Each structure stands twice: as structure tokens, then as C-alpha cells.
Design a protein around this ligand. Sequence first.
Ligand code: HEM
Length: 154
Amino acid sequence: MGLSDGEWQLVLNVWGKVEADLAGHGQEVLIRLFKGHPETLEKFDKFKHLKSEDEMKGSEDLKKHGNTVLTALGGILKKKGQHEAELKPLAQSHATKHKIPVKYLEFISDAIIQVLQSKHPGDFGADAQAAMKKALELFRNDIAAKYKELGFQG
Ligand code: HEM
């Protein structure tokens, strides 16, 4: 489950690229998510009326939640596995209010990796792709344990 020190440095390096525009990257992520797995959009009461992609792209709220989403994941990844404090709140809201099953967390993880590969290939080689996958996998897994405690079967 854990990542080596070098694997984390691969994650932090490609992140450094995402940092310059979190809202724009988060928008792309969510658009891949909704486009590859349309069922996830029903979870979003505000974004649900969005139809095509260009519809999703001119939504200013969508881009702000993109920022919301990657702001929080950034804080998680920069802890390099020591993210208990940061997962506490995210788990609570995604296991009670929102009810986000873990496979939708897998969807969005794939989305993230698709966006990074598309936008920053020079900073996202084979081992950084693997490292980020494990990082998000370690994220999903520790959330899932929190889900258990909270009474959610994701
Ligand atoms: C890396 C994965 C994710 C991160 C870091 C993340 C983070 C957040 C944050 C910070 C919020 C606002 C504060 C809060 O609710 O705690 C939020 C809200 C929300 N999340 Fe997530 N999220 C993730 C994945 C997902 C996925 C995959 C879905 C749905 C399939 C989802 C559904 C929602 C919804 C519906 C809200 C309410 C937002 C609103 O309507 O304003 N989340 N998420």
C-alpha cells in the first residue's frame, strides 16, 4: 500500500504542475468523470442539469468545485501517507450527506491520472503514473476504513 520516498517525490513533482491552476485541472477531471461515468453526476444536485461537455465547460460552479476538489487532494498528497487528520472531514461528508461509493472514488482517480497524462506527460512518466495510482489507491483505501466506522458501505 505505502509508497517509497522516491515514489512520493514522483507524486509531488507532477503535483507541482497541477498547483498553478487547480480550478482548471479540477474542471477537466470532473468532466472526464461525468463523461466516462455519467451516473456520478446524479450525486451532484447542482451540476446535474449539465448535458454535453461544452455545457459542463461553461459552468463556473463546476470549475469552482474542481478547485475545491483538488485543493483538498493536494493537502492529502503532500502528507505522503500521513493524512488521517485530512481524511476525517472528507470521509464524514462523503459517507453521510453525500454517500459516495468507493468505486466512484476509483472513477475520479482514473480521471485524475487521465488529466495529468494528457497535460503533463514530461512530468508523468511510467513510474510516476504507477506512484500516483498507488497514492490515490491509498487514499481510497483509508477513506473506506473510515466509511466502515461511519456505517457506510461504499
Ligand atoms: C479525490 C476525491 C474527492 C475529493 C478530494 C473530494 C473533496 C470534496 C470536498 C472538499 C468537498 C466540499 C467539502 C466537503 O464536502 O467535505 C466535496 C463535496 C462533495 N463531493 Fe467530493 N471529493 C472527491 C470525490 C467525489 C466524488 C467522486 C463524488 C461523486 C461521485 C463526490 C461528490 C461530492 C458532492 C456531491 C459534494 C457536495 C459538493 C456541493 O454540492 O457543493 N466527491 N468533495
